[PDB]
């Protein structure tokens, strides 16, 4: 189904940060010598909550935490990136047979 | 302000008992964690143990297993039970404070008490006069063959501390203590001028007020 | 774990299992990974509360996930928390470990309490979000946002940092201090906006009542009224 | 994991600069604290974090040092100086705390006033006699103090104590006590103690004769 | 630091081919795009083409026919060629650095970052007239200058005392005259007691028909 | 394709300018802007659509979305009048025609106007310039008329349009050819600079 977002409150602006000064293509921005240090290689951007999105959102990550969990209990390795590498697997094996 | 008590110490056999006891008061026991340390016979310093204002208990290895640390918070009161002692734990003992926010850094520390830990009989000093004999004149009072420590030793009930010197004790090759305390006056007070010790040797109930007269 | 997915705005959630021919997927580039705060759903976030919500306990490993996009941080905490006699509470953080990225208080919490538990986790599932990397445990002296990750799949196409001073912090008769000197505080009355600590700041300065060589701690109660402890 | 110090005792004048040393087994992110005790009185807090001056400490104190050396430094060493200072790792375990290193002002000799006293009467009763030899207000601490009974020179039955250099005018005081069996004591006639000290240009002999 | 530098101002006959090179100094040509992009007078810019040094260059659709581009590694150097020169093609042209980075599935340009100073080349067959320069003879200030007549075309520069005298200096664009001639005035402006206390020379640059004057300007009203 | 901007946008002193940039699906592709002074190379501004290089100060932003691209400037200078273009990339190189900033309510400033007489020099080679400078006027335009005595003079003259002075005053000048003859046959010559509806006039004669 669609989701209902159902927590306490939800502060519906998204100031988000992400990986890239994506403008460090040019120059030597590039090469780790020069460069960004540590706390520069991030971008902002807000998100506005168009439609019940960013709400919606907030919830979903409240909801899915208890799989993610107990996905995390059943993993031997320390520190878990595979996750999405997985769901974009199991989908590709998905529409390749049943 | 902030002022800390101990209480409880004294002389003891080796294997057996004392319980220290330290007053807190200036601030809020429920805030601090509370150590104690000690200073053994070779004047180095010594952390003992420790508790937190939950109860959680810490040991130096050296004493862990025979003694035990307590606190009670509404009564801003704590405890050191000390068992199975050993003449290695002769020492003064420090009720201390630590910081509040990082563990180990000692702030407050209290007035320390005496522990010994020794075969040998509690027993009263005799106190003589040293009597004075030129501008200035020296007298005092000879506290001999006491045990165990510690003596304390005032002047005219702390009015005259000028010039005052009491010694450390030493002790005797019958193993008693014995210990001097002179004080320098001016040569023409004397026969005018009354100087009366006095000593307090509390582990032997023992009070002696001894006036000095000259010659 | 389900799959949240987008339509122009619409979100739907749905696994694969249940993706319908034509969500068009074209790309692994249309998989994120996002962390938002627990901040942003009503969570109170007053270090006593905050404080509260966390908890202590050993036999159980520490775990990591890792999130590519996060969200700005009104609230942020720093533990450098120990057991009275030195010993640390928390383990050290490991390498890549860094402290959350976008703080606008960062709540420096120094303090000593006992630890009965090796690790420190969270009390209702949520993760500690540090620089991309959500982590089940609180590292030392490492700063963090208490938040839950969720999985998406698109469509085509400065700080400043405030100290405590606190005791017996895992247990239920905790004492809370906002650190303003070396030798003064104030005591938390849990309801303390980061701004309003930050005017108190400024009218420690301003007024005058930073204690001289012998330390204070007073106590403000609602220009207004600060009083003093004994 | 271990503290041990450097020196164990060092001497300078008033004003002078001085260096003690801390040497740490292992490193342990530099959380070292500096504690000084006067002599017969209460350590107290002086520095943490290397290099934090507490409260009610002259700027002339300083600390620094990283890893596993440290250091701290008075850069106009005063009487009141005096003590014993000791450092300690603290927010590490386990707490262990230097050996100490012992600070005495480097003065000029002050010559000890001598005094003698002979046993008192009540003592005598008793079955024993004490004579005391008293050195006051000296520096150096170090003293020859000799007994001598009936100009022999007396060996193994007396003992020495020595004060705690004082806050004040930074000079010593010394007791030398010989006992005696009662008998042994009415078996002579001189008792003379005498002080042999760099302040002396020659030995200072006080005596009585019994009775 | 990365610099950019066209060849030099001047003429190109109509109909004949114009060669122009930029050179790139304080850095290696390999890492950057590098672009021609040309200005003509009292209107806006015009994308010619672009290249990488281990690439194929990319034209214009309304130049492809007419235009060229090359690199030399070694020399460090970018040249232009363009075919069947008009009046039309009268402009100052940059060469332009342009960034490389991948986005949106492959290495792209990104952005014309750094633009050269531009070289203006006028495109004429009136042989190349020299200017004949004039000296222009001088509250509490006095100017004097020197007029550049009768030259064509554009451009023309001009110093004073080679270059060390800048202060006061005022070069005014050219008129052009119905003749079809180019005419423009440079002056510098002294105080009242410094002027005749040193020597005023002013230097024309024409470097289309390759001439160059040192006219002295004596300080007599 | 094309990108569309306005010929000009003006702003009051230390106040917001916005220019836009249009064209078809515009938000589908990149924008750059670029600020042109007088006299002087283009300079990138903004890549990217909001993207700022070093050296660009944060009162200028970027943004793109449907089909309008925005470049504003807060706090606007005098200073900041230049031409700005819109650049894109659509099957090739896309350059929008470039907006003029002009920033308003301004003071004002009246030409300085110097006129030479023709040179000993030019008048031995045969020929006569008379030389009418003009500089540090605001606003940019200027009319210019000649005299012979009390006499308008139609033929001869040549004037430049006005240009970007260096502390951002403006600049033109004017000629008038004369025959020898001519220059000597009068009393005097004079140059009418008519600035904002009033005039200032100086005056040569052959001595």
């Not at chain 4, 009540?122 to 050195?135: F, I, P």
């Not at chain 4, 009662?182 to 004769?209: I, M, R, W």
């Not at chain 6, 003071?107 to 540090?136: G, H, M, R, W, Y």
Request: aromatic share 10%.
């Amino acid at each position: 189904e669609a989701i209902v977002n159902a927590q306490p409150k939800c502060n519906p602006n998204l100031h988000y940060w992400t990986t890239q000064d994506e403008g460090a293509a040019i120059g030597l921005a590039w090469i780790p010598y020069f460069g960004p240090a540590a706390e520069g290689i991030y971008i902002e951007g807000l998100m506005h909550n168009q439609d019940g999105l960013i709400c919606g959102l907030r919830q979903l990550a409240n909801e899915t935490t208890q799989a993610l969990q107990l996905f995390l209990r059943a993993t031997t390795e320390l520190r878990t990136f595979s996750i999405l590498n997985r769901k974009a697997i199991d989908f590709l094996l998905q529409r390749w047979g049943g | 302000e902030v002022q800390l008590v101990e209480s409880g110490g004294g002389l003891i056999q080796p294997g057996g008992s004392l319980r220290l006891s330290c007053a807190a008061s200036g601030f809020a026991l429920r805030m601090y964690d509370m150590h104690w340390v000690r200073q053994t016979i070779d004047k180095r310093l010594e952390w003992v143990s420790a508790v937190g204002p939950s109860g959680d208990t810490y040991y130096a290895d050296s004493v862990k297993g025979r003694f035990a640390v307590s606190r009670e918070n509404a009564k801003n009161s704590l405890s050191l039970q000390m068992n199975s002692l050993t003449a290695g734990d002769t020492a003064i003992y420090y009720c201390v404070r630590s910081d509040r926010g990082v563990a180990g850094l000692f702030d407050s520390w209290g007035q320390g008490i005496l522990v010994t830990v020794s075969s040998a009989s509690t027993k009263g000093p005799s106190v003589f006069p040293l009597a004075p004999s030129g501008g200035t004149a020296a007298l005092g009072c000879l506290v001999k063959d006491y045990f165990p420590e510690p003596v304390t030793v005032s002047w005219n009930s702390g009015a005259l501390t000028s010039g005052v010197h009491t010694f450390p004790a030493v002790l005797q090759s019958s193993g008693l203590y014995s210990l001097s305390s002179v004080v320098t006056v001016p040569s023409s007070s004397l026969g005018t001028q009354t100087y009366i010790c006095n000593v307090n040797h509390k582990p032997s109930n023992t009070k002696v007020d001894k006036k000095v007269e000259p010659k | 774990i389900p799959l949240g997915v987008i339509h122009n705005s619409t979100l739907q959630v749905s696994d694969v299992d249940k993706l319908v021919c034509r969500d068009k997927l074209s790309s692994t580039n249309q998989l994120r990974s996002v962390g938002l705060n627990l901040e942003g759903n009503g969570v109170a976030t007053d270090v006593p509360s905050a404080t509260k919500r966390w908890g202590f306990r050993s036999g159980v490993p520490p775990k990591v996930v890792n999130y590519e996009a996060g969200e700005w941080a009104e609230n942020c905490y720093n533990l450098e928390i120990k057991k009275p006699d030195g010993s640390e509470c928390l383990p050290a953080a490991p390498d890549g470990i860094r402290g959350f990225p976008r703080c606008r208080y960062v709540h420096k919490v120094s303090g000593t309490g006992p630890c009965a538990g090796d690790f420190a986790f969270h009390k209702e599932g949520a993760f500690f979000l540090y620089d991309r990397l959500a982590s089940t445990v609180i590292y030392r002296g490492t700063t963090f946002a208490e938040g839950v990750v969720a999985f998406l799949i698109l469509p085509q196409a400065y700080s400043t940092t405030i100290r405590y001073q606190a005791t017996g912090f895992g247990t239920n008769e905790t004492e809370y201090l906002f650190e303003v000197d070396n030798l003064t505080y104030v005591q938390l009355e849990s309801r303390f906006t980061p701004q309003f600590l930050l005017q108190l700041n400024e009218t420690i300065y301003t007024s005058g009542k930073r204690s001289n060589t012998t330390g204070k701690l007073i106590w403000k109660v609602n220009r207004s009224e600060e009083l003093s402890f004994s | 994991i271990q503290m041990t110090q450097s020196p164990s005792s060092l001497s300078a004048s008033v004003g002078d600069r001085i260096t003690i040393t801390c040497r740490a087994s292992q490193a342990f992110d530099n959380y070292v604290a500096w504690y000084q005790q006067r002599p017969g009185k209460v350590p107290k807090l002086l520095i943490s974090a290397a290099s934090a001056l507490h409260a009610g400490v002259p700027s002339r104190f300083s600390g620094s040092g990283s890893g596993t050396h440290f250091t701290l430094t008075i850069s106009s060493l005063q009487p009141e100086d005096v003590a014993t200072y000791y450092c300690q790792n603290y927010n590490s375990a386990p707490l262990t705390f230097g050996g100490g290193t012992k600070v005495e002002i480097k003065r000029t000799v002050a010559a000890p006033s001598v005094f003698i006293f002979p046993p008192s009467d009540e003592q005598l009763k008793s079955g024993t006699a004490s004579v005391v030899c008293l050195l006051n207000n000296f520096y150096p601490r170090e003293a020859k103090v000799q007994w001598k009974v009936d100009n022999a020179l007396q060996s193994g039955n007396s003992q020495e104590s020595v004060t705690e250099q004082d806050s004040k005018d930074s000079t010593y005081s010394l007791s030398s006590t010989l006992t005696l069996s009662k008998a042994d004591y009415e078996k002579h006639k001189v008792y003379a103690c005498e002080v042999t000290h760099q302040g002396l240009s020659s030995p200072v002999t006080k005596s009585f004769n019994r009775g | 630091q990365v610099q950019l530098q066209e060849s030099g101002p001047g003429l190109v006959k109509p109909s004949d081919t114009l060669s122009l090179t930029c050179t790139v100094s304080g850095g290696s040509l390999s890492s950057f795009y590098w672009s021609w992009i040309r200005q003509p007078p009292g209107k806006g810019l015009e994308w010619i083409g672009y290249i990488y040094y281990s690439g194929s260059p990319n034209y214009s659709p309304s130049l492809e026919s007419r235009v060229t581009m090359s690199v030399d590694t070694t020399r460090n150097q970018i040249s232009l060629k363009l075919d069947s020169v008009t009046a039309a093609d009268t402009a100052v042209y940059y060469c332009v650095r342009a960034s490389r980075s991948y986005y949106w599935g492959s290495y792209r340009p990104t952005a014309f970052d750094s633009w050269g100073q531009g070289t203006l080349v006028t495109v004429s067959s009136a042989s190349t007239k020299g200017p004949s320069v004039f000296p222009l003879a001088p509250g509490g200030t006095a100017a004097l200058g020197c007029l550049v007549k009768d030259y064509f075309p554009e451009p023309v520069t001009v110093s004073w005392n080679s270059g060390a005298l800048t202060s006061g200096v005022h070069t005014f664009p050219a008129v052009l005259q119905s003749s079809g001639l180019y005419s423009l005035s440079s002056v510098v402006t002294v105080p009242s007691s410094s002027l005749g206390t040193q020597t005023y020379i002013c230097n024309v640059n024409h470097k289309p028909s390759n001439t160059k004057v040192d006219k002295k300007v004596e300080p007599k009203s | 394709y094309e990108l569309t901007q306005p010929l000009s946008v003006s702003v009051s002193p230390g106040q917001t300018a916005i220019f836009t940039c249009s064209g078809d699906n515009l938000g589908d592709k990149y924008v750059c802007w670029f600020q042109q002074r007088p006299g002087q190379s283009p300079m990138l501004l903004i890549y990217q659509d909001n993207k700022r290089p070093s050296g660009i100060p944060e009162r200028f932003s970027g943004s793109n979305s449907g089909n309008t691209a925005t470049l504003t400037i807060s706090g606007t200078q005098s200073t900041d009048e230049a031409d700005y273009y819109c650049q894109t990339w659509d099957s090739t190189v896309v350059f929008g025609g470039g907006t003029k900033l002009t920033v308003l309510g301004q003071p004002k400033a009246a030409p300085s106007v110097t006129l030479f007489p023709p040179s000993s020099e030019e008048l031995q080679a045969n020929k006569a310039t008379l030389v009418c400078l003009i500089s540090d006027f605001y606003p940019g335009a200027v009319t210019v008329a000649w005299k012979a005595d009390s006499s308008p003079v139609k033929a001869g003259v040549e004037t430049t349009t006005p240009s970007k002075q260096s502390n951002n005053k403006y600049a033109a000048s004017s000629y008038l050819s004369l025959t020898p003859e001519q220059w000597k046959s009068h009393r005097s010559y004079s140059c009418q600079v008519t600035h904002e509806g009033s005039t200032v006039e100086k005056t040569v004669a052959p001595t």
